[PDB]
Design a protein around this ligand. Sequence first.
Ligand code: 118
Ligand SMILES: [Mg+2]
Length: 268
Amino acid sequence: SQIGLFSKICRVTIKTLHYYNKIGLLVPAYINPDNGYRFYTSDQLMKFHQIASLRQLGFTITEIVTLTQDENSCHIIERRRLEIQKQIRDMADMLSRINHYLQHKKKERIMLYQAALKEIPECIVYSKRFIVPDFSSYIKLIPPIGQEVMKANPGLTLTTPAYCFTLYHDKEYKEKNMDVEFCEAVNDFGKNEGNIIFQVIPAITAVTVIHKGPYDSLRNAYIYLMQWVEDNGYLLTNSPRESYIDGIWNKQDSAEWMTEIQFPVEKV
DNA sequence: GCCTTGACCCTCCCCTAAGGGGAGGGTTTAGATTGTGTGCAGTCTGACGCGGCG
RNA sequence: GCAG
DNA sequence: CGCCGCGTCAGACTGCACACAATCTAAACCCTCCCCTTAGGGGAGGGTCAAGGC
Ligand code: 118
Ligand SMILES: [Mg+2]
């Protein structure tokens, strides 16, 4: 059976048979030496059937070489079983994500906020946890802390890139009784004089959305994020953070400012 | 100024998986056919040299 | 096709 | 040795403008080699940037 007839028997292209010969997966029975023409037999169709049966299960080519040459190799198929289970979980989450994205673009003509699930590493921060009467009053008392901590810790260099955020330790919603904890990441340990202390903040996977503009609309992102958090079945494992990209330090106009709200979540 | 020095950074080349697509090369084709035809140009005269040829 |  | 046929060799110089050539046919197989597809990784080769000491 010449390669054309055989390629139509097994119903696959010629280049596929060329490739399977090139990698040594399916070798013709008899190659004519001067022309190089490949001729197969029935016992090449018998092997191509096994090859295609394994290849419909997603096995990579080298995995098929091993599956056909090494017997009692059930650990590689089980490994592939676990990987396929992981991709099914991931694809179902993707389904929920794309349903929510389509649900939004029909709900609003503009996508104001996209939600990204990113991993944030562990940090070394100086932290002050305290009650706040008003979030507007919360903004002013931070540069005093900036003076104070650099005073008490000489030569303490903050991490680059700068990570300056807020934990919201409140389990429900209110506007004037916010129990917050301001954390900012530095390089080394330090002195703990004052309400300012040092602590290690563990690495977390968190869904974050970046809101750009003034802070009075920031709650929007939270409602959105909360929707997201409930829609895709994620569970909020820790208190929500808010990391400051743009603000009074870089830029003077308060409408081009930008913060990023981060929800610590776990997949359940 | 004269140097070093570690940290960055750019471009470019090749690599990934499983083949697709094409370029550019080979090979055989088993009824039997068996001598080129342009509706060609040919149309320029005079001098000179050389060679068959009686 | 033309010019001298 | 003298003559006729045949072949070869020439045929003003500058300029513009215009403008070439135009018909004329195989197909079905196979092979190798090259470049391409994702979403960036890895690394050689070669600049560049603040810092510091001489
Ligand atoms: C110590 C404490 C706070 C700030 Sb900053 C800041 C943070 C990261 C990168 C750049 C600046 C600040 C504010 C105003 C003027 C100058 C600096 C800051 C304040 C509040 C919330 C988040 C960050 C700086 C040092
Ligand atoms: Mg003329």
